[PDB]
Design a protein around this ligand. Structure first.
Ligand SMILES: OC[C@H]1O[C@@H](O[C@H]2[C@H](O)[C@@H](O)[C@H](O[C@H]3[C@H](O)[C@@H](O)[C@H](O)O[C@@H]3CO)O[C@@H]2CO)[C@H](O)[C@@H](O)[C@@H]1O
Length: 362
């Protein structure tokens, strides 16, 4: 089945309800202690998530999720330079997981994620561009026959890791590198075989940041209507993403102001300019505050739905402890842990509320 619809991204995006990330899974990176030679697909579970199965996705699809992002870290599974051959058992497992939502008719986003080699520094950009082309040549070849519901996202949050400008929008060095890398990704996939000339491709601004500086220095192609801007927006910060000092457990007036500001940024940079965009990651972590988060999620969803922009929940499988607690589905037991959040996504999207597989009330 190698058919692909010839459809613009803006038209295709209309078919998207809302999404879910298979977080802390194929993106988990454990090369400091795991032997990837003896465990070539072991990294999937090395951050504590269960082995992925189709029923995780069917549980979510029952709740009207129809976009599934598969964040994938290829670092550790890549052969030596300059061929950068991807381990074939790893590629097969990535392929099995893409197929869980894809063969059930949903949208799938496959990316490159926690890579050590695509950092946004001019020092290494010549080498990083070669590795990016080699990696995407192989991904594009493996999935060349897939239709329009399989989307490639060329980079995740390329940035100047470990610098003062890592998380505040970047600087000119970082913007030029991210743009050059995005161009290599687009060219590599467009130049490849099969349906890839008509595949929908996502590219991020620097760090995928919802930021004035990142947005303003983001190059976007003017002659390719099947390219999509990839943005991440865990907004407002202290309520949604702050895992240290200053975190708040209520979505208050100042938090709404901050969220409204960033949504308006997306409107002015992308929506008003006819640039297709997807919020590929967002979420608010568990602070024993499900109703605060449900109200925030319904408001966020309603506002971006009025702009035609879909969003994709970041679910890293973590519910308690010191880590970031973005879990939404209990993958082991196939239960929605926060049913009022899922109800908020449905209601805010304009859908009928029907939360299936909810956990019992304790
Ligand atoms: O517990 C296992 C490891 O967790 C690592 O933290 C991860 C968070 O749990 C996860 O929520 C976060 O998700 C990122 C996403 O990958 C990224 O694309 C986006 O820019 O931000 C999201 C929210 O922060 O990923 C991190 C990994 O970077 C710990 O860092 C690690 O020590 C620990 O072993």
């Amino acid at each position: 089945s190698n058919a692909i619809r010839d459809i613009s991204s803006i038209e295709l995006i209309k078919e998207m309800r809302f999404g879910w990330n298979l977080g802390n899974t194929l993106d988990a990176e454990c090369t400091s202690w795991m032997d990837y030679e003896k465990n070539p697909i072991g990294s999937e579970t090395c951050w504590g998530n269960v082995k992925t199965n189709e029923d995780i996705f069917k549980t979510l699809m029952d709740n009207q999720f129809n976009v599934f992002r598969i964040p994938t870290t290829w670092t550790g599974h890549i052969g030596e330079a300059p061929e950068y051959k991807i381990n074939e058992q790893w590629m097969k497992r990535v392929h099995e997981i893409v197929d869980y939502p894809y063969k059930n008719g949903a949208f799938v986003i496959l990316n490159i994620h926690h890579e050590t080699w695509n950092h946004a520094f001019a020092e290494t950009v010549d080498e990083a561009k070669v590795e990016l082309a080699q990696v995407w040549k192989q991904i594009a070849e493996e999935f060349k026959g897939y239709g329009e519901r399989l989307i490639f996202e060329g980079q995740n949050a390329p940035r100047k890791n470990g610098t003062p400008v890592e998380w505040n929008g970047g600087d000119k060095e970082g913007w030029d590198v991210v743009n050059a890398m995005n161009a290599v990704f687009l060219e590599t996939v467009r130049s490849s075989g099969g349906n890839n000339a008509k595949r929908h491709l996502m590219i991020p601004p620097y760090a995928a940041a919802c930021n004035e500086n990142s947005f303003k220095n983001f190059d976007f192609p003017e002659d390719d209507d099947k390219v999509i801007a990839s943005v991440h927006a865990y907004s407002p910060y202290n309520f949604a993403l702050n895992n240290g000092e200053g975190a708040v457990d209520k979505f208050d007036a100042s938090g709404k102001n901050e969220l409204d500001w960033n949504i308006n940024l997306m409107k002015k940079r992308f929506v008003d300019q006819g640039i297709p965009m997807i919020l590929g990651e967002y979420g608010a972590m568990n602070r024993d505050n499900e109703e605060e988060r449900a109200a925030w999620a319904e408001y966020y969803m309603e506002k971006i739905t009025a702009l035609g922009v879909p969003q994709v929940w970041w679910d890293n499988g973590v519910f308690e402890g010191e880590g970031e607690r973005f879990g939404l589905i209990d993958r082991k037991n196939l239960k929605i842990v926060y049913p009022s959040i899922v109800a908020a996504l449905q209601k805010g999207r304009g859908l009928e509320v029907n939360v299936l597989h909810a956990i019992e009330t304790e």
